[PDB]
């Protein structure tokens with residue numbers, strides 16, 4: 001094959017370390033660090049308004065339009081040295097309103113019929129996310145209960161920032177990604193468990 005290598009953090013301290021060493025070289029304004037901190041205590045509220053009005057902020061309250069602009073700005077400084085793999089956790093409503101109450105049997109195991117409906121609906125296709133993408137350097141335990149697990153592959157030089165410390169209200173080994181990002185679902189298979197779906201997306205960029 002003609003496949004490229006991505007660094008996957010196999011240990012928490014190794015991630016925490018590489019992580020903090022990237023926080024240094026960013027040099028974020030005081031203004032942004034509070035936009036990122038407010039973003040971690042409101043990630044739900046903001047991304048919701050972002051997926052909604054499909055990227056338009058010229059209707060958002062003043063407070064917001066500014067924060068949104070500040071978050072975007074911050075990414076001019078937060079890129080990644082080399083190719084990396086990030087981990088995200090999602091609930092069924094992520095795949096669609098139809099998988100909401102169809103994806104998992106009351107046994108907790110994944111329904112192989114709904115799984116195929118999804119595999120056909122997304123495999124080898126590009127998805128577009130309107131809000132920001134919170135992720136982790138590893139499959140931390142704040143996912144693991146979540147039925148869907150995406151594994152992003154981010155290319156050298158792409159916007160990605162280790163905001164773990166910048167906000168105390170940032171998840172474990174948290175790594176933010178720019179809004180409006182577009183990735184390509186390259187693989188879907190069930191965990192060697194029975195309950196999950198292990199997606200393998202390939203990021204491309206943000207427009």
Ligand SMILES: [Hg+2]
Pocket residue numbers: 009015019084136137138162173175
């Ligand atoms: Hg990381």
